[PDB]
Amino acid sequence: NEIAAQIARQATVRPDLSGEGEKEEPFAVVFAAMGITQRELSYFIQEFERTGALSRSVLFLNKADDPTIERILTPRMALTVAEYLAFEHDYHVLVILTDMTNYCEALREIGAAREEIPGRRGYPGYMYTDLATIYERAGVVEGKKGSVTQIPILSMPDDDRTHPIPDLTGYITEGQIQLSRELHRKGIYPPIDPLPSLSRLMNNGVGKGKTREDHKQVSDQLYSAYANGVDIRKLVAIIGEDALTENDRRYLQFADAFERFFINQGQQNRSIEESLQIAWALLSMLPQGELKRISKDHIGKYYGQKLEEIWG
Amino acid sequence: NEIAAQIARQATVRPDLSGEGEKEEPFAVVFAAMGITQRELSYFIQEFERTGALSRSVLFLNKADDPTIERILTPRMALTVAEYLAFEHDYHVLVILTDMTNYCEALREIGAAREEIPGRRGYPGYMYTDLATIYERAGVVEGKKGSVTQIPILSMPDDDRTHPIPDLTGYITEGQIQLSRELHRKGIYPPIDPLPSLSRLMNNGVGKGKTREDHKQVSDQLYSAYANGVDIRKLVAIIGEDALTENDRRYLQFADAFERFFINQGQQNRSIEESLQIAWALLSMLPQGELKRISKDHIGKYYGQKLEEI
Amino acid sequence: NEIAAQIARQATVRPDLSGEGEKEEPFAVVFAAMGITQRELSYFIQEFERTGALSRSVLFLNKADDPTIERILTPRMALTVAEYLAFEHDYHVLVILTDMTNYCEALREIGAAREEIPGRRGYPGYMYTDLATIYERAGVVEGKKGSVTQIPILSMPDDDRTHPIPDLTGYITEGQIQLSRELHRKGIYPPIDPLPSLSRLMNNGVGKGKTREDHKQVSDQLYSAYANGVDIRKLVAIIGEDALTENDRRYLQFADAFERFFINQGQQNRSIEESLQIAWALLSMLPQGELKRISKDHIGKYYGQKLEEIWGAP
Amino acid sequence: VSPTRMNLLQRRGQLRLAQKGVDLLKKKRDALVAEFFGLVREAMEARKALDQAAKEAYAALLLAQAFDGPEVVAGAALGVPPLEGVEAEVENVWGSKVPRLKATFPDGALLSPVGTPAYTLEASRAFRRYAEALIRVANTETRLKKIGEEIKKTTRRVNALEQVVIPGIRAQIRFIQQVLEQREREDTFRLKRIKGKIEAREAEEE
Amino acid sequence: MAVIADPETAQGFRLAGLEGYGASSAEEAQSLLETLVERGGYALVAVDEALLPDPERAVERLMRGRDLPVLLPIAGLKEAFQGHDVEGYMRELVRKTIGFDIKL
Amino acid sequence: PGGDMSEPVTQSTLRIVGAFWRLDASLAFRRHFPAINWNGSYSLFTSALDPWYRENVAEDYPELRDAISELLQREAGLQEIVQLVGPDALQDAERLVIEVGRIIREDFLQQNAYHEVDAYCSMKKAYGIMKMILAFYKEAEAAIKRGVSIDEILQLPVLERIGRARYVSEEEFPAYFEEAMKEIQGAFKALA
Amino acid sequence: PGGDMSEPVTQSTLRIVGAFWRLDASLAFRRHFPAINWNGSYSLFTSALDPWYRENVAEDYPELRDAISELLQREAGLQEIVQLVGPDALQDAERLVIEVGRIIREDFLQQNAYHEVDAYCSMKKAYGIMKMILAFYKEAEAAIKRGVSIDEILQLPVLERIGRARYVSEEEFPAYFEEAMKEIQGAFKALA
Amino acid sequence: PGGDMSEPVTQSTLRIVGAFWRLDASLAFRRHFPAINWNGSYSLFTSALDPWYRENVAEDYPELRDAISELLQREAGLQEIVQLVGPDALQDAERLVIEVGRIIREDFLQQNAYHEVDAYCSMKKAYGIMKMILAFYKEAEAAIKRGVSIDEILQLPVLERIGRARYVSEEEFPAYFEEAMKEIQGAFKALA
């Protein structure tokens, strides 16, 4: 919920990087809450009040003590409003579905009352189609100014990525942002671990003339280096740190510096250039020749900076 | 089965130590055998006959080839008799249920015959309620002198404490006594492992006017010292070094002597005073540098015993 | 499929080894294909026709898109023909059944279509009995000279021997021949792994008057020596070549040459004498007296030959 | 960890790999033990040689001090430049580096062989060979200690595997098996219910 | 190298050009051994068995990460003249590094 | 059932509750009560209560609590290295962290609900115990940097005062805390 | 569902397809693409296509492909020990096999579907890359047998040329391949 | 299914049967027949059958049987040590108990089902063999206490007498047992 509120507070386009160079209206927010508790509801209300976004936000609130069959209607009504606004009044709508696990619970209850032939874990077999009829309502339409962006939130029951709800959701959506309990216990916020995360439309929005020429290659190199660091952590769990080589030690240091600086950022709002320079400072910890996924032009242009040079 | 028979033979009230000193109140043993084999049945009959314990006993004996419903009904009859005796004739009744695993298998068979909703491993979903309706009948009633005590013996399948039978039984009963297979391999009888065993009602059943005044402190000290010895010997395996701090070797020797003398008692019918004497003899650790888990001044009264046996 | 075709077009009886010299004992192959693709069908037809092995074979070929009831009936037809030939014309019949996993899946689907509640692991509760009614039709009968021999072929679904199909097949049949994926990806054909393989009736059909006096002991020595070679191959990766004893290096060489020449047969048709000669040449790499499973008589009679059958003189 | 059939197969494969690793480490420990028991005999030989060298060196010292004044032998010890020309190459044993000592002991440090007292040359040569035998003993001891440490490390790894890795994998395997069997039992129960409802809704409707 | 023993043995080792220290008690020898280790010039230090039975109690106080200045116990010339217990030392060494009392 | 936290009741409960007090069987078997699995447990009210803690207990109470949690995290991490390499072959600073984590557990986290005094603990008593433990840890760390061996640090009698702090009644505790602070100062002053 | 390859649709598909390209989430998390699980994949068309490969790619192409597959199999076998005792516990030959395996995985099996050059690869370019990798492997093994260290081998810039080979365009690839083969021979003659 | 005793049928069977004769194929591989694994095998009828044994074969039979079981247990408990180091390097008492365990395995537990005499064995013949074995063990323990070499004992002519004991006919066994008990005592008396 904190991450969703932060994204809704900070989300903005960068027309100067895209070459449009024009002032942009802020996002309209459609907030659909299904089975939400009073704590989370109060947090969201207070955040939207502090940021002043309530005057442009439509709210559909189904409390945890409200009847559960209304949760079937709630996201459909929210997305009807979102589609209407976006594709008939040129609004850029950000839609937050606060808990799809509760929606799937209500769907399972209705299906079991009807004795529907269930899928895995007792959920009805039409759950994929039902979730698709909700998710696929976002997007951009030719000849229309407006847009619908969906950020559903679901809680994997036992942090199980293979549970039917997250599995079907990942099969429908364009990637996902997955939170890590290990990073959260370390005190890192936001606790987003990038390896299980994914964005399928990332290639469309980044690159030359959109964000910067090195964005994609920097992302790939960061992924490769962090995966190497994680593997070396697993190796250290056997042979011990002192038995490592110096390159594995460098990858281990890159991994923990990555976690503590690139991921752990608190409530600050980082521009894409700030994030890119932090990423390049992190990549400068590694030998220059080991940045195999980055072209030599970008390496020559950006390699060398140090983290302590960014902040004291 | 051997431990059950030994407890049935040896169990006694000990009213002389009690503050309300009196001639012994009637004591009786109700013994229920469920799914028992002919060999075990012969063993139990011989054990009860050879010591005269049969006279103060009632036996309900359901054989393995008997109809499965009689295994269900057997603990009902046993506890009905126990409740009648205890709460209408002031008897102190001790109830022994020989194998609740067989009873639960019979219950699973009956439930599957009725086509009920299943449970964790095929057992009926209401097995907790049934086991509770059996076990909760034990207790003491205000205004009545009698009592009902239950010792249900059960065989954990594959020594898995998370199996439904021991899990539900622990969820219902006030503690458990767990036998150790490793102590059995070492030839120790009875092979009771004190570390995972627990008696919930113990803390208010011992003290002045009940057992001896040093009972709870002695028990706390024994548990602490045995745990220290075990956690030393487990670190020895990982480190692979007998060479270690001197005080650690005192606990390893203490742990070995504890297992070989206190736990290993064979068929001896040790009194509570005898068991406390053995415990205090085993407390050959330093009076203050060790023996510090429980603060006690009973050292000046009981310490200094030199392990001498009979 | 390649191994099935090779066995089908290579299998023969050896009455001369029993001393009968009776080539009058006929031999036939009954080939039942279940749930095969057009590629496999074309391969089987081409293999059976190119060598002339079709003239002594009956093919019951059921395709993957054919009705599943036909798949269920195919082994019944094949075994009916095999029983008829063997016990009414004294034929020696070899029945190859590929693939029994497809048959089990067809049985599962047909049971589901008849609204039968499945048993263990989602397969029909009577799959053991059905597989038994298929397998137990092979055998030799007192008073009759024919025989039925079965080589079921089944793909373990996830290379899991605990799966119901291979598990029940192991319950019913006498051993198994296990193909090896690591041998296959090293380029060895046929990729048969001797260590997990087992023939439970082998000791009854080998020895004096049947194959040769040294067969059983040679097989035992080969098994033990190959196991030693394999585990020493694992050990040499960490401790190095020179750290091993000389006989350990000899075991390494034996395992390498064994995989190279004994297992890696290719499309050759090796008589049992050729295979025994190759085995003895491989065992001659080990020092005399290290062959402990073999009696001194056989060692004196056969030890000494060197590897020439496959390389240097094919 | 997620209980699935594929995950169960992965756990079984990990169990097989752990058992194969236990066997491999036992074979490695066998090789290490053979090398260690060779080295113990070699070090025993070296130590006996050191005993004899020390015996003769002390005998030479006593005879020299009897036949020559302590001041003269002390001054002779002062006169010789110290034989500091020592180094230890990093011998590699079983992937571990050990310092292997070697001493040059140049004879250019010997002053006036024909001008020294009667038993100074004998004591000098005896102590020189005693020192080099001591260096031999040190090399044997360091190699033996390294092999023993490697044996202890392999024993640690084998014990850790067989005691906490394999049993944990077995417990995970049985847990996953129980979960899968429970799901199968639930599926069978649902199939029974729907078959009963098919039969019933066909029966009453006719 | 260097040798720590009685002053007679230290003089005898200086006679061959090797560093030597004369010590009568264990604490004095260990104290001078610490300074000798801190010097670090010599690659090997020899210490009498009757002086320090177990120099491993002093090896690890310094040279925490480095092992190049190796050290070992030795029989002093007084008892070496009588005779050194090679077999007992070998048995105690194999017990120290293995711990199974395996001999013959 | 069977302690399986993945069962439906537990999982449907975790979605709505604000605090999750996870008990552990391994701690209960070894009589380490309350037996809270501090690694698996969590609370979502910790942040919102900080102004009350600052106003009513101590201005620096959240920092003490965070430092205690960090020490527990470091001890839990170092336990893996202890099991891998052995507690003998790791640096005296990490041994100090391990011993301070043991002290935190057995003297602050452990609580006997049947003891006549230990059964209840006020917020200020807990704050005093945390201050004792952290003062001891920082002084012992300075001593380790000062060349003092961890053996004599572990032998200091101040550990007995720290361990017995939780049995001190609420009435006596404010003075016991002052004398414990003075003793902690004096002990590591006496190391010189 | 859940990536469970034991699901009935996947199992039913196994029994009727001639090729099986199995993907694993482990490589996708690492952003190693196409992310084909080599161990779990297979093809039943390798044998029948060999005459076409000999006529249209190179007469020795099947042998080169078989050698690459055998190297991958050896690497898979050695990973069982690597996960047990670490990569440094291996001998030089086995560690060389591990390194050549990761070189294969990183600059032959990887293919960027969005890179303007790497998105497509003709059969002859793949043949050239395989020939380069195996020539390097043979020369490196020969140098290992003569006492050269593996860490010395891993620093050769010709490794960088091999890695960058896949980004070379189809038109200019033959010259790059000839230059790199000459560089392999020269580097492992000069560096022994 | 694959030798897993935890399967439901085996678990149900072992709950009601009075004995479990865990036949083992490893012993059969090593030509140990009847190949019953004395470890992992049990019988619950010994205690009830003890009076019949005392009456019908010999009064000392249960204690002699317990002695044989204890020797087997000691041999089992020394297996890890004899695995890590060879039996020749093992200590003298441990060497003796290993050798007497081997003697038991070879001459009492071993039984040739196809032999014309050894196929059947009476209770008294087994008792005589066990008493001979324990006489040998007592004498050898005394001799080891008095300093003879284990390799001298391991070559005594009485050993082949004990070996051939199980091959004698039932009616000839009593006199053979008497004269063998004479020979063993005389031989160990003659030794120093």
Write the DSSP string, E79-96.
Answer: HHHH---HHHHHHHHHHH
Instruction: Say whether G18 and C238 touch across the interface (CB within 8 A).
Output: no
CA distances from F163 to A4, B132, B224, D63, F102 (A): 45, 41, 16, 67, 11
Helix (H) or strand (E) holding E19: strand E19-22
Strand pairing report for D86-93 and D96-103: antiparallel
Residues found in chain B:
310
Residue with structure tokens 């939780």?
Answer: F166
CA distances from F126 to F23, F73, F108, F114, F121 (A): 21, 19, 8, 18, 7
SS3 content of chain E, % helix, strand, coil (to 5): 45, 15, 40
**Resolution stated for this PDB structure, in Å:** 2.7
Nearest in space to E74 (alpha carbons), one of D130, G42, B16, B289: D130
- The distance of Cα D119 from the centroid of its chain, to the nearest Å, equals 45
CA–CA dist B187, B104 (Å, integer):
30
Handedness of CA B110, B115, B120, B126 (dihedral sign): negative
The tokens for C132 are: 């038994």
Do the beta carbons of residue C111 and residue C148 sit within 8 Å?
Answer: no
The tokens for C8 are: 């089908």
CA–CA dist E47, E68 (Å, integer):
16
Name residue C61's beta-bridge partners: C33
Do the beta carbons of residue A104 and residue F15 sit within 8 Å?
Answer: no
CA distances from D69 to D65, D78, D120, G171 (A): 6, 14, 11, 93
Phi, psi of C143 (to 5 degrees): 90, -5
Chain A nearest-CA distance from F152, in A, is 28
Q: Which residue of C lies nearest to H2 if distances are taken between CA atoms? A: C162
Half-sphere exposure for C249 (CA within 13 Å, toward CB): 7
Instruction: Say whether F86 and B238 touch across the interface (CB within 8 A).
Output: yes
Q: What crossing angle do the helices spanning A246-257 and A215-239 adopt, rounded to 10°? A: 120
Domain span at E7: 1-100
Q: Which residue of G lies nearest to A292 if distances are taken between CA atoms? A: G163
Q: Report the SS3 class of residue E21.
A: strand
Would you tell me how many other CB atoms lie within 10 Å of the CB of residue A54?
Answer: 15
Chain F nearest-CA distance from A295, in A, is 38
CA–CA dist A90, A140 (Å, integer):
11
Half-sphere exposure for H150 (CA within 13 Å, toward CB): 17
Structure-solving method: cryo-EM
Instruction: Say whether D21 and G3 touch across the interface (CB within 8 A).
Output: no
A162 touches chain D (CB under 8 A): yes
CA distances from B146 to B25, B84, B91, G15, G26 (A): 9, 10, 5, 72, 67
Which region holds residue B186: left if phi is over 0, alpha if psi is between -120 and 50, else beta?
alpha
Q: What is the CA radius of gyration of chain G?
A: 18
| Through-space distance between the first and last CA atoms of chain B, rounded to whole angstroms | 28
Instruction: Say whether C158 and G6 touch across the interface (CB within 8 A).
Output: yes
Q: Which residues of H155-165 are buried (b: 16+ CB within 10 A; e: fewer)?
A: ebebbebbeeb
Q: Report the SS3 class of residue A33.
A: strand
CA–CA dist H181, H175 (Å, integer):
10
| Chain B residues touching chain F at CB-CB below 8 Å | 120, 162-164, 167, 195-196, 203, 223, 227, 235, 238-239, 241
Cross-chain CB nearest to D31 (options C118, C158, C243): C243
Q: What is the CA radius of gyration of chain H?
A: 18
Q: CB neighbours of C61 closer than 8 A, spacing ≥ 6?
A: C31, C33, C36, C41, C44, C45
Cis amide linkage into residue H157, ω under 30° from 0: no
CA distances from D182 to A121, B119, B128, B167, D194 (A): 11, 8, 18, 17, 19
| Through-space distance between the first and last CA atoms of chain D, rounded to whole angstroms | 50
Nearest in space to A17 (alpha carbons), one of A203, A210, A196, A249: A210
Do the beta carbons of residue D11 and residue D173 sit within 8 Å?
Answer: yes
Chains that touch H (3 or more CB pairs under 8 A): B, C, D, E
CA–CA dist A169, A161 (Å, integer):
10
Q: Which residue of D lies nearest to C160 if distances are taken between CA atoms? A: D9
Instruction: Say whether B203 and F114 touch across the interface (CB within 8 A).
Output: yes
Do the beta carbons of residue D48 and residue E86 sit within 8 Å?
Answer: yes
CA–CA dist F151, F160 (Å, integer):
15
Do the beta carbons of residue C102 and residue C156 sit within 8 Å?
Answer: no
SS3 content of chain C, % helix, strand, coil (to 5): 50, 10, 40
Chains that touch D (3 or more CB pairs under 8 A): A, B, C, E, G, H
CA–CA dist C35, G19 (Å, integer):
17
Cross-chain CB nearest to D55 (options E81, E94, E97): E81
- The distance of Cα F40 from the centroid of its chain, to the nearest Å, equals 16
SS3 content of chain D, % helix, strand, coil (to 5): 80, 10, 15
Residue with structure tokens 């380490």?
Answer: F32
- The distance of Cα C35 from the centroid of its chain, to the nearest Å, equals 21
The domain segmentation of chain B, as residue ranges, is 1-303
Chain D nearest-CA distance from A160, in A, is 6
Helix (H) or strand (E) holding G188: helix G173-190
Instruction: Say whether C121 and D184 touch across the interface (CB within 8 A).
Output: yes
F81 touches chain A (CB under 8 A): yes
* Chain F residues close to A157, C-beta within 8 Å: 6, 11
Q: CB neighbours of F186 closer than 8 A, spacing ≥ 6?
A: none
Q: Which residue of D lies nearest to G91 if distances are taken between CA atoms? A: D95
Helix (H) or strand (E) holding D126: helix D120-160
Handedness of CA C159, C164, C169, C170 (dihedral sign): positive
Q: Report the SS3 class of residue B31.
A: strand
Half-sphere exposure for B114 (CA within 13 Å, toward CB): 13
The tokens for D70 are: 């302590």
Nearest in space to B100 (alpha carbons), one of B65, B132, B56: B132
Phi, psi of A131 (to 5 degrees): -70, -35
What is the count of structural domains for chain E? 1
Write the DSSP string, G94-148.
Answer: HHHHHHHHHHHIIIII---SSSTTTT---HHHHHHHHHHHHHHHHHHHHHHHTT-
Do the beta carbons of residue A164 and residue A119 sit within 8 Å?
Answer: yes
